[PDB]
Symmetry: C3
Subunit: 554 residues, 3 copies
């Protein structure tokens, strides 16, 4: 309440709720994260606003459902995949960094943004962190990917199938069949037809080889503020470089209230580790990455102690969504983390998709060793930090998040989230209703993703499930659950609360009905126009030839 | 004589007469085959009707010289090389399986057929085993080949030279020369000429890469009856899978007279072995394959003993032709077996080409431990088994084979084969005359194959010798031998029997003359029309894309 | 003086003056070369006439500056790089081999020529050793190169950049950009434009792959006299094969005065060694090659002792120019030798480029253990050997070399080289003035090569420095040195001899002025016409197809 503490918000990438020690895992070392939970409050029902990166991060920055800002797609691509695309967090949205910057906070983003970069010109930076309330940025504008690390697979394999391999197999089989029919004297094949087929194969293959050659340097690079500093990105000491930049930022601000958003690349695939962590872990390179990340967190923690800032710094730890079930190396090396008890994971709205770790420590104000089981959202951070900074909330627009501090301080027992809505990109997937004066958590599913292998935990054919069409199965009436009684979501409710369906579904359907009546009519940041590679947007660190390449970090 | 015993005919692929233990080899373990010879009769002059697979097997199935059925080519290709080709054992030919099936035998083929599959439509199966007297088929329609096993060479290298590498070298050298002449100002080369050359190179290379990609799955696959069960064929436990199918067939017929043809893939190249045999042998992976094959034979033998069928089962063991001398890995790893004393081998009519093991066991009727040195043919099985089954011989056509049982039972001392003819595919290579009341074996050569390396045992330039033109050398007068005196064929007769040439060559030339007067005028199953790949004949096990691929065996 | 001794001239390739034991190196074993220096005279200021192979060897053969014979280029290519090019030592030049052959010497060249081969027809051999005074030739017509040994790099990388990789990157980026603009609806791209781009890429790549495939066999091959004997050249026992041919030549001439030029392939890159030398050395495969070369020299030395020819054989040892500083494996493996104290090296006119070992032994006439510090040239051999053979010098043309024997015999104290000129290919680089009755060595630089990495010893961007344009920096006034006081050339003279510049530069500039007034107007053996690959000049040892390939040595 206008006391202006320092604020550090830490976001892991695809860390599952079953990964940290303090959430039940007995073999992953996260001693510094569980230190945070033991010294503070550990949220038990903390819900990301989407099970994919870009929309979850949009909602975290704005305190607003991603559909309110057109940051959720209608197509299969739910996150930005090219740095040189025009979609991004709209210029008229207000982040908590801007709210806090307007109150005199020093603001910095270290690590992953994934909310766009430029719009019309490669230097307008309309969606860049520095245009969205951050005074300093060190990190990457897009995301880590398999493709960013050579010999680690590709997130584009499904796409290569429709657009490259299958057309090229049709052309090739047509050419071989025509040549045989010609040779057997069943068909005169004009050379023009052979020419057309060879020409088409050569064009498809050239485009494909161009994509293979250029994607990593054009899309996997490090920036400081508006400049490229390493292209392609090096994984050498990556996490340590992020740690040093975050520690240095804090040291520049020991007498100035500051806001640090520390947005790790871990543990999104293309897993990696320094020499100090490699090989020595529970579940493969995944474990080394998880606990390299915990090391980095401890380094920041030890800094605040050394600098005597720990008592009046609020620290929040989360991941943007749950771990990715379908993430399996071609050699079967099991990447992706654990969501523990809960079903599903990244890219669906089963509990393992959206229930993420949520830890808050603020030693001066928040009682240590607490545990909040009430439903909270990662959109709640926006109003929490705004009030703490003395920044008024925006009054020209809806804010879906709710201040956490009355709950964190014991002034309140039940959170201000009687209804929450679970979107699958742009499509309303599930409604959550934790009724008042009640303990149960009603959860209806307008649809469910068709898990690709039988009985399997995920959608291993398309690597992620989708939200619409052939990949999904609608349910009428809505398909109801009680998350209070079974977290594992392993039995769909019907015989128990049957004398209650139509009365409680009507109050949940009206909530959705009332809800989608506040959704206005906004540009789609994921339209083809805004998703596709635009040559004039491509940032290219000057090198020899037309090559994009430098290591100004070195 | 209408006693209807069970009948098992076992055919190895390219097993040389110098390979089995019971034929003199002191380092290959064939304990189950030599068991057969010790319990039965071991033929010393058993002669395949051709030194190549397809015609030898045609003659074995029909009891008839391959030229009688148009199953011998005039070109360099002597065996079928594509499953989707229309040549095959003609529909009007009668196999011993059909003769025996018409007497109520249960009939089965396990393993290699190599006598065609379909004619006009991919499902007419006009040449398939089930249309030629077999009630059940488990195996492959074509043959094992180097190309069926990845990283094992190719039988098509000679062909790649004429059709791919040499044209592509001409185009490439023309293009480089033209570019230099253009650049030096000696010749204006229109872009159309460069375009034509590049276009032609691209087309040749695409066709070649298509062949490299598709040949194995389109031609190396397992079938049961009319259905593909594994495509491409897996070599995992291959011989054991064949053993189980053959044992199961016998077990379905313990009270029904049955005919099992067991036609191994061993020891034709693409050699292979289970884990139980790999590495532990005499002469490389060849030895492991030979004695894996002997293991399989012992398993059938032990079955008949367990089931109490051994006493009234006739068993025959042979290979389709002699071992392949010219079969040498690129790394020099010596594949192909041994023909021992005899000269030549697979694809020529020297003794090592056509003299093959021939073992018969029938404990109730055939005295154990016997040894027949009289000339016999692998065409003799057809009338042997027909009489045993009570099936009358076809009387509308010539049968060249002769019942073996009077000889096997000691009722006769000299076989009914005063003259035999040795074809090199469609061309009469050699005449054999074992005169009556005589011991010598006169063998004339109308021509001989030009062994490619000097003094070498085979034709290592084209991998096999041929039967016509540049690869051969005619001889007038016919070039005479006495196989009784030297098996090694190491000295051509002239000074010894010189006062006998013109009198005995005239009686052998009249035999050939009389012989080729019975050869009628028949379709060529090896014409280009019938040898070449026809797209509409291609069996393709349904998979994703246009790919031919399944493992319904699994 | 018409005593007709035998004469052996030994030339290493790129052996630096800091490599032999007898010149100060304490870790390279050259026991047979330093034996030569201990038994004879070791020249301290022996200067190659050029720091590149072809012109240095031209000047050695003719006793004449390379510009006098048009054997120095104006372009970046300073040596012949194709056997099938028409440039070469002009037919009107006279070598010392021809002078000596005309006096009745038996003459032989063993090893590297690098002065051309044929002119208009592949069999005119207008520039071949046998047309330039040698009666016998065993060796290579061009040079050893990285490209002659597979997996050893390429001397053409810079060229691949301008002519292949950069054009192909422009075409590829244009194609990818056009495809994206077309796809985004900003530009209709006609198929003709895509076709043109693909066609151009295919042509560039075909030419490049043709160069990669054909360069080694077409340019790296062994000859005896006018015939190819091994194509491509084998490195197996290469140095030993050269040793045997040189020893055999001597043995054919134990009673006939003979001239042996033994021109090693060592130690030019594509380094190599027999089994007897591999792995056991100071500075890598370079050391093994250097001391394999010393072994070969000892073998010739021991021969003359065995044959009792050592006392009246004059032996000379040198290398054609200094070691190559910029020669570094891609894996950083340090190839190229050491120039010791002196600056620069191969392809520049700093002292390390042109100051080479120079050893003479002639036990009957030359006092052992001597050391000549006077400036001498590798052009001095021509008149030395001519007088020894009784051959008169050519009187229709200038000879720049000067007989060494008055100096070697102690009849004279100062050499006849008051002025020498240091050419960078065709461009006068430096003037050397060792004034008379003086000890200092004045050296002016009209220009200097711009060493590519900062402070680096060489020009590592273009692998060698050049002589003109962007790679060089002119100096007015000429940039003066005193080589007597500092060999390392590490301080440019100005404050010391400042009251002497304009008076001594005017006498050195007049020397150059007077000098270039004797340079006549001659064909350029390095014109594009004479450097470029001509298809009709290509020697091709007959093989299968259009392939150039044989091992008649075997
Ligand atoms: C005629 C139809 C062509 C459509 C091709 C669209 C071009 C796709 O653009 C791709 O985007 C990536 C940029 O990050 C790059 O790696 C590749 O250069 C590029 O091929
Ligand atoms: C300094 C920020 C970028 C300005 C440089 C503009 C030129 C960008 O050049 C880019 O190079 C890429 C591969 O080399 C291509 O794939 C892109 O089409 C091209 O736009
Ligand atoms: C214009 C001249 C073209 C003649 C090419 C003949 C096509 C050869 O057909 C080949 O047969 C095999 C089928 O088993 C396949 O592996 C290949 O698809 C195919 O290229
Ligand atoms: C089920 C028995 C076959 C019916 C399927 C008909 C389609 C066969 O498709 C075949 O695919 C091959 C490679 O994919 C091509 O090389 C052949 O030209 C093509 O005929
Ligand atoms: C239209 C412009 C084309 C110019 C290409 C010049 C051809 C270069 O000639 C090259 O020389 C080498 C001979 O030793 C060979 O290895 C290659 O065959 C050849 O490509
Ligand atoms: C015997 C001396 C040479 C006579 C043979 C003339 C034919 C030379 O053929 C050469 O083959 C090379 C690659 O194969 C090509 O690159 C050359 O353009 C071509 O001229
Ligand atoms: C923080 O609070 C604890 C407990 O009240 C105290 O021991 C510690 O010294 C405080 N640190 C600072 C920097 O005030
Ligand atoms: C703990 O994490 C590992 C991998 O990070 C996972 O395999 C395991 O299932 C997790 N624990 C539980 C109880 O799920
Ligand atoms: C087969 O014959 C042998 C010897 O006559 C006998 O020992 C054996 O029991 C017989 N087997 C059967 C199944 O009749
Ligand atoms: C026995 O077989 C091996 C290979 O199978 C062969 O090398 C050997 O020559 C054979 N024995 C005789 C006597 O030929
Ligand atoms: C060479 O000279 C030395 C010393 O004068 C002598 O010992 C040796 O025998 C001579 N050799 C010949 C071959 O004359
Ligand atoms: C001796 O030679 C080696 C390599 O041949 C070189 O590294 C070293 O510098 C040389 N010695 C001196 C004193 O330069
Ligand atoms: Ca994520
Ligand atoms: Ca065979
Ligand atoms: Ca040199």
């Amino acid at each position: 309440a206008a006391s202006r503490p320092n604020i550090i918000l830490v976001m892991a990438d695809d860390l599952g709720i079953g990964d940290p020690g303090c959430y039940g895992n007995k073999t992953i070392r996260t001693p510094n994260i569980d230190r945070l939970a033991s010294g503070g409050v550990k949220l038990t029902q903390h819900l990301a606003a989407s099970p994919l990166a870009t929309p979850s991060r949009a909602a975290f920055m704005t305190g607003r459902y991603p559909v309110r800002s057109g940051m959720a797609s209608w197509s299969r691509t739910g996150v930005f995949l090219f740095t040189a695309s025009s979609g991004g967090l709209p210029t008229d949205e207000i982040t908590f960094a801007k709210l806090l910057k307007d109150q005199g906070y020093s603001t910095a983003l270290i690590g992953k943004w994934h909310l766009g970069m430029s719009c019309h010109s490669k230097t307008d930076f309309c969606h860049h962190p520095l245009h969205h309330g951050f005074n300093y940025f060190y990190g990457i504008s897009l995301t880590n990917l398999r493709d960013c690390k050579p010999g680690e697979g590709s997130v584009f394999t499904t796409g290569f199938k429709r657009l490259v391999f299958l057309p090229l197999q049709i052309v090739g089989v047509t050419l071989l069949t025509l040549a045989a029919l010609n040779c057997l004297g069943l068909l005169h094949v004009p050379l023009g037809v052979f020419f057309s087929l060879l020409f088409l194969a050569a064009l498809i293959l050239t485009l494909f080889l161009g994509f293979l050659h250029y994607f990593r340097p054009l899309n996997c690079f490090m920036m400081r503020n508006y400049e490229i500093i390493q292209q392609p990105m090096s994984y050498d000491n990556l996490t340590q470089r992020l740690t040093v930049e975050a520690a240095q930022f804090i040291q520049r601000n020991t007498e100035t209230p500051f806001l640090l958003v520390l947005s790790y690349l871990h543990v999104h695939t293309a897993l990696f580790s320094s020499k100090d962590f490699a090989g020595k872990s529970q579940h493969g390179v995944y474990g080394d990455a998880v606990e390299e990340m915990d090391w980095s967190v401890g380094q920041i923690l030890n800094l605040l102690d050394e600098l005597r800032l720990a008592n009046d710094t609020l620290i929040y730890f989360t991941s943007d969504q749950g771990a990715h079930v379908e993430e399996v190396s071609s050699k079967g090396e099991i990447h992706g983390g654990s969501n523990g008890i809960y079903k599903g994971g990244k890219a669906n709205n089963w509990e393992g998709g959206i229930r993420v770790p949520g830890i808050l420590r603020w030693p001066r104000v928040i009682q240590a060793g607490q545990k909040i089981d009430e439903p909270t959202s990662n959109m709640d951070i926006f109003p929490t930090v705004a009030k703490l900074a003395g920044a008024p909330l925006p009054e020209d627009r809806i804010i879906d998040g709710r201040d956490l501090m009355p709950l964190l301080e014991g002034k309140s027992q039940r959170s201000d989230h009687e209804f929450l809505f679970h979107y699958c990109n742009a499509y309303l997937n599930a409604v959550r209703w934790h009724p008042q004066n009640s303990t149960s958590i009603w959860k209806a599913f307008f649809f469910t993703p068709n898990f690709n292998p039988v009985g399997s935990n995920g959608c291993f054919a398309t690597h992620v499930c989708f939200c619409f069409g052939s990949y999904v199965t609608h349910h009428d009436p809505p398909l109801l659950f009680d998350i209070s009684k079974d977290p594992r979501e392993r039995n769909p409710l019907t015989p128990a609360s049957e004398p209650r369906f139509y009365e409680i579904l009507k109050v949940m359907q009206e909530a959705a009905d009332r809800h989608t009546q506040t959704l206005p009519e906004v540009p789609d940041q994921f339209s083809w126009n805004n998703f596709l590679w635009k040559p004039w947007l491509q940032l290219c660190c000057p090198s020899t030839g037309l090559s994009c390449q430098c290591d100004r970090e070195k």
